[PDB]
Amino acid sequence: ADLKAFSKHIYNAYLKNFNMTKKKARSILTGKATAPFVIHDIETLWQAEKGLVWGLPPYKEISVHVFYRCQCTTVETVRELTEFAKSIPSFSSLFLNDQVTLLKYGVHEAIFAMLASIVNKDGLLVANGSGFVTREFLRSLRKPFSDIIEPKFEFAVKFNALELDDSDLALFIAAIILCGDRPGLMNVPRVEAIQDTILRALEFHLQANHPDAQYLFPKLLQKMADLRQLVTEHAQMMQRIKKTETETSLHPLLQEIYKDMY
Amino acid sequence: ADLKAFSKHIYNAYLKNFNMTKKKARSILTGHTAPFVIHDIETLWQAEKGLVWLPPYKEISVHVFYRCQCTTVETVRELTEFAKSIPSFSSLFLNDQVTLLKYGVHEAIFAMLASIVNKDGLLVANGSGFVTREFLRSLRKPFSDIIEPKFEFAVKFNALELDDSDLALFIAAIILCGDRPGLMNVPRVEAIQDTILRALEFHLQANHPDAQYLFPKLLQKMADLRQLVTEHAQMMQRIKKTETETSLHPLLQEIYKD
Ligand SMILES: Cc1cc(SCc2[se]c(-c3ccc(C(F)(F)F)cc3)nc2C)ccc1OCC(=O)O
Ligand SMILES: Cc1cc(SCc2[se]c(-c3ccc(C(F)(F)F)cc3)nc2C)ccc1OCC(=O)O
Ligand SMILES: CCCCCCO[C@@H]1O[C@H](CO)[C@@H](O)[C@H](O)[C@H]1O
Ligand SMILES: CCCCCCO[C@@H]1O[C@H](CO)[C@@H](O)[C@H](O)[C@H]1O
Ligand SMILES: [Cl-]
Ligand SMILES: [Cl-]
Ligand SMILES: [K+]
């Protein structure tokens, strides 16, 4: 494969399928020419919900409302990641069951990697950039809901230090989805071969795009391992919430993702 | 009238994605170049040598079994693309798409098989071969027994004289089935199926104005196909149990996983 044309193709599929790019997010977070409405307590969340910014279950309390907002966010991103993946060369050539296995075990890894794009150390963009929810407000939620969000900030701030751009991330995300190690995958050799092409494209891309960045490719391989561990811990927290907070609901798609994880 | 447009869209998906139409098949089966007739070991070998066209060759009945599997896998590819070319199907989450295909493809395969079948045999290799029903009956058990019920279904199904535009809606209705195990968005699939069934109802009145009771007859055929697949799966289970030297294609393993 022509690696340069391959990478540009995945870059364009990324721009076509993800509305909020890191480029757009960073210009908002630094104030380039409407600023985001800051959500930092109940009153501003309520205002944001009325129209300042923005279906869900009936409002019971702040921590559960945020928990449901998190689920709606991730379900939307699963839709975008599905369309993105279908544009990766030879992903659509897999039988549909292997496509589902790759997305099932990969979407959260990709979500938490892309989450870093819309995050700084003080909070995250919500609602296509029109809101900003502060990290301190999220810490103020009652357990178990506060504990599940903070590790993602921790990962994101370290990941953002690598200073990837959208062209890097498009290959990185593709590599996460095209993973031959997923449980129950049918055509492992084919998935392994696609991933190798993506990784060779990524290594080549980084030489060109980050010439002075030392050890960047192996650092990104380690971040992929780090994300797998982040997702394992996240899945375990979600299952504990499902067990102890019997009155809170889990979106059916997320139940299907978390079904056979442990 | 929106149903008419909806039907035309499903018909185009069918014309775009299936390798063989019933119109094409029936013209071949009624006679440039006729299909090569496979009716015994010698003619099957000639067909494999290039006259028409897998795991290492063990014996005739198992060889045919493997060709059945290859044919099925190919049709799963086509049915996947057909369903993806239906917008309301492609809007479901991918897991529901897989559930519908997992539990629907064999029903659809056996319905479409009728298109390439007459009482004497069936077309193979994109119509360039014809394998006789008598030859398939001559294979050893368990391989002869699993094929014959499909001829019996097909001859009765072909007496309804559906054309490709009818079949496109019929197959869409089979795939968009709200009753499949593990389906996530059941009400959405149910809504799509009811739209397909209403479009089919109107299509049959337009296309078969004189055919009395044709729509309920097709609903019954859908029920019959579910039973045919139940019996087929039981026979495949017995082959997995008793023919330990015969392999099963990985995709079919996933379909039959249970
Ligand atoms: C419980 C849970 C936590 C996380 S942590 C990363 C976060 Se925080 C967040 C958010 C926060 C506040 C608001 C609001 F203030 F506006 F309400 C909106 C959005 N979005 C993401 C992606 C990810 C998934 C998840 O559950 C869904 C799943 O497992 O798929
Ligand atoms: C074992 C089995 C039987 C059937 S019966 C309907 C038939 Se017959 C046939 C065929 C016959 C002869 C030849 C050759 F003589 F030319 F070699 C080629 C093709 N194809 C189909 C679809 C369907 C599935 C199945 O197993 C696969 C599964 O269950 O998925
Ligand atoms: C498009 C036709 C695919 C038919 C085989 C589906 O097979 C299914 O794939 C799922 C993974 O997607 C598995 O969870 C499930 O156990 C398996 O039976
Ligand atoms: C595209 C994202 C799909 C994530 C949910 C996958 O969910 C899976 O769907 C399969 C049916 O296809 C089931 O066999 C399996 O049990 C379920 O875990
Ligand atoms: Cl940061
Ligand atoms: Cl089945
Ligand atoms: K017939």
Side-chain angles (χ1 to χ4, degrees), chain A:
Chain A
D2 170 11
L3 294 183
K4 194 166 191 285
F6 187 83
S7 300
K8 183 189 174 181
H9 178 87
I10 293 167
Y11 182 35
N12 290 319
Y14 172 103
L15 294 175
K16 171 137 170 53
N17 288 282
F18 298 114
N19 184 221
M20 182 61 58
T21 65
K22 191 170 180 184
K23 192 180 183 286
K24 294 179 191 182
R26 291 294 124 180
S27 61
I28 294 164
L29 296 164
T30 61
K32 312 310 172 53
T34 52
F37 180 90
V38 173
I39 303 170
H40 68 106
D41 58 13
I42 290 180
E43 203 289 314
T44 57
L45 174 65
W46 178 70
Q47 292 188 329
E49 287 276 13
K50 288 207 296 172
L52 265 311
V53 172
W54 287 278
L56 308 174
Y59 187 93
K60 13 183 169 183
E61 56 162 304
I62 182 63
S63 298
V64 163
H65 182 77
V66 175
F67 181 70
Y68 292 155
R69 279 283 186 205
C70 296
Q71 295 186 40
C72 292
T73 307
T74 57
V75 165
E76 175 55 30
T77 306
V78 172
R79 305 182 117 111
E80 298 190 308
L81 284 162
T82 294
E83 299 310 309
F84 173 66
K86 288 188 163 290
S87 313
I88 291 168
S90 54
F91 178 93
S92 286
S93 81
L94 303 168
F95 283 101
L96 219 64
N97 54 315
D98 275 349
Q99 296 182 34
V100 167
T101 292
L102 291 175
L103 288 163
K104 168 178 173 175
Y105 287 102
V107 286
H108 282 95
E109 292 177 17
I111 287 171
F112 297 151
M114 294 182 296
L115 175 66
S117 300
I118 61 168
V119 157
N120 66 34
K121 70 178 192 63
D122 295 321
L124 78 154
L125 292 171
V126 302
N128 200 238
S130 57
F132 181 86
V133 183
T134 74
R135 187 180 185 179
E136 206 62 36
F137 173 67
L138 293 174
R139 282 162 170 164
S140 77
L141 308 179
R142 60 171 183 91
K143 295 194 174 212
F145 304 105
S146 47
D147 305 337
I148 197 172
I149 298 173
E150 178 63 10
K152 286 63 162 179
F153 279 101
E154 293 180 65
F155 173 94
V157 172
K158 288 189 291 194
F159 190 76
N160 277 340
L162 299 182
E163 306 194 31
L164 306 185
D165 69 19
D166 291 311
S167 71
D168 308 320
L169 289 166
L171 291 167
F172 187 76
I173 301 310
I176 284 167
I177 304 295
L178 273 301
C179 173
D181 191 16
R182 302 305 189 189
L185 192 58
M186 186 178 65
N187 194 346
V188 178
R190 181 61 176 162
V191 175
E192 287 180 352
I194 300 167
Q195 197 189 31
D196 195 57
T197 299
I198 298 171
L199 290 177
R200 304 210 190 205
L202 176 63
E203 174 162 69
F204 185 69
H205 184 74
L206 297 174
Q207 284 298 270
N209 198 36
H210 301 267
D212 307 338
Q214 206 159 356
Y215 295 102
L216 185 46
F217 183 71
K219 284 179 177 168
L220 294 185
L221 297 176
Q222 182 58 232
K223 293 304 189 189
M224 300 177 69
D226 296 337
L227 287 160
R228 183 177 295 207
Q229 178 60 37
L230 195 64
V231 169
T232 296
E233 299 163 6
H234 180 79
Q236 298 171 349
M237 291 192 268
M238 296 293 288
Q239 303 273 40
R240 269 190 300 274
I241 293 172
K242 179 161 63 190
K243 288 196 284 284
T244 64
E245 306 275 334
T246 50
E247 69 302 336
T248 66
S249 48
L250 186 61
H251 185 295
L253 181 70
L254 303 183
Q255 301 181 23
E256 296 303 298
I257 293 178
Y258 291 135
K259 199 158 64 185
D260 299 312
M261 297 184 180
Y262 60 85

Side-chain angles (χ1 to χ4, degrees), chain B residues 102-103 106 229 233 255-256:
Chain B
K102 173 181 180 182
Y103 291 101
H106 282 92
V229 171
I255 290 173
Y256 288 111

Side-chain angles (χ1 to χ4, degrees), chain A residues 94-102 104 183-184 186 259-260, chain B residues 76-77 79-80 89 94-95 97-103 105 250-258:
Chain A
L94 303 168
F95 283 101
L96 219 64
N97 54 315
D98 275 349
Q99 296 182 34
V100 167
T101 292
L102 291 175
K104 168 178 173 175
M186 186 178 65
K259 199 158 64 185
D260 299 312
Chain B
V76 173
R77 304 192 122 100
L79 283 159
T80 296
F89 178 96
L94 211 63
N95 56 315
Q97 295 182 31
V98 165
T99 289
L100 294 181
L101 289 168
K102 173 181 180 182
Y103 291 101
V105 285
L251 180 63
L252 300 182
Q253 300 183 23
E254 297 301 290
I255 290 173
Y256 288 111
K257 191 185 296 185
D258 289 312

